[PDB]
């Protein structure tokens, strides 16, 4: 289990305040959303296990998000100052932080990393006590945060409040978060030539998103000719993924797809 | 729960 937060602050010269968008995930389930451009700048829920929370919870979350937007504006100004970038160009500042949770032993691994214009900028090390800078412009932020002890501030949250929030979110939604949705699988056939056809191994409606799909021929792996696509969200919380292979006609019954998912008691081997 | 805001960049 893991809890993660994704912040995106993009600037816009002349238009006004830079847009700030914050999202929160438990594993592959989004539960919170904040947009500074909305006419109602509040922390809005995205899951049934956070709408149960009272008004105080959302009040604290909302004020934190607004102050974070202010801080990210200041950060964008300082960053365009560091890289000597023009005042007319738009720039994106991303943040990703979160905590992992093992079956026992409290937290497993915490992280808090940043990005400027799509590249690594500064990253909190795994010991949660030191930083790593990508270039010289990030060493300025490194020294600024070493003086202010930003690392200990983030460690107090990751090692403490993050784990407690994650465990609470798990307990108050275990019927939709701690279970597993097995993938519904089938194989489709599509001729492309007089003697060649494509077998497509489908996988629909599974949770979480991580799954293993691979075609094998005569029991041995066939990886160099299988065209796989990225895991696509179905829209109702589930995911989708398929893998296709081109085959000479007649030898189709010898090809076999394997599926590996968390919701299966054993990886399933199926043919067409 | 989201983290608090810290020192600016």
């Amino acid at each position: 289990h893991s809890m993660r937060y994704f912040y995106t602050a993009v600037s816009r010269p002349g238009r006004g305040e830079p847009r700030f968008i914050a999202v929160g995930y438990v594993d592959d389930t989004q539960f919170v959303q904040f947009d500074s451009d909305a006419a109602s700048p509040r922390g809005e829920p995205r899951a049934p296990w956070v709408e149960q929370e009272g008004p105080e919870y959302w009040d604290r979350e909302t004020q934190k998000y607004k102050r974070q937007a202010q801080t990210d504006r200041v950060s964008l100004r300082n960053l365009r100052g560091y890289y000597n970038q023009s005042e007319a160009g738009s720039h994106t500042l991303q943040r990703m932080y979160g905590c992992d949770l093992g079956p026992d032993g409290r937290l497993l691994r915490g992280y808090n990393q940043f990005a400027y214009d799509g590249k690594d900028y500064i990253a909190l090390n795994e010991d949660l006590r030191s930083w790593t800078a990508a270039d010289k412009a990030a060493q300025i932020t490194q020294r600024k945060w070493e003086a202010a002890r930003e690392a200990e501030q983030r460690r107090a949250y990751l090692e403490g409040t993050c784990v407690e929030w994650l465990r609470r979110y798990l307990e108050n939604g275990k019927k939709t978060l701690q279970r597993a949705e097995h993938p519904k699988t089938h194989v489709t056939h599509h001729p492309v030539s007089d003697h060649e056809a494509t077998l497509r191994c489908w996988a629909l409606g599974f949770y979480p998103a991580e799954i293993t799909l691979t075609w094998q021929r005569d029991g041995e792996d066939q990886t160099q000719d299988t065209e796989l696509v990225e895991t696509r969200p179905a829209g109702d919380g589930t995911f989708q993924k398929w893998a296709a292979v081109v085959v000479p006609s007649g030898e189709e019954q010898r090809y076999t797809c394997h599926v590996q998912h968390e919701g299966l008691p054993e990886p399933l081997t199926l043919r067409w | 729960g989201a983290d608090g805001v810290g020192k600016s960049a």
Partner: T-cell receptor
Amino acid sequence: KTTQPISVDSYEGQEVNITCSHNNIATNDYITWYQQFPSQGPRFIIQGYKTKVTNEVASLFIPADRKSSTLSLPRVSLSDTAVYYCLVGDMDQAGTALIFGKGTTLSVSS
Amino acid sequence: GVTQSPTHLIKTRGQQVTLRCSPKSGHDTVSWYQQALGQGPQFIFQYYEEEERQRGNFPDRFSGHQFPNYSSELNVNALLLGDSALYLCASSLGEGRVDGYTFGSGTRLTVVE
């Protein structure tokens, strides 16, 4: 917010327990205790979250529901006459500052 | 640890006063409290990065300032007789609790008729 007794009477050498009620505590809140001697300012004692905490001067008991707390002084002396404050503080950075309550006035005798 | 100034002082109704506080070495956030006789400390405002970041339930007669060296001043004018109290100053690190709150000895203000 926290509520606690107005005063606690005790004698020298005994163990003193001060109970503090904070039912509407949240997940992102921590517990702390402060001590104020006459004409002085509040002095820190002990803080915690959910487990038993014990330092050189006091002990902190927190039940599972976190809806109460108990500050335990092992062997009180005549120098322990002060006002003890039970506070529930915001755990988030740049959050609400520490808010005090009425406090509990401890009186020890010999 | 925390250095408040002055220790004691006397004022009259309608006058103004400026109290000062120097935080503990290592802290940068300052918070002011008013403690009346018989009651607990009541939060006034918190200053970080030379700006007021949080404020309690006190009128605009109570103003504050913070200097680049984290030192702070509480300027309260038009003193009413109800403003007699011990003014406390607490220092913290970056509006956090890792470096916990540390209060000073206090400033005893008694405004008289």
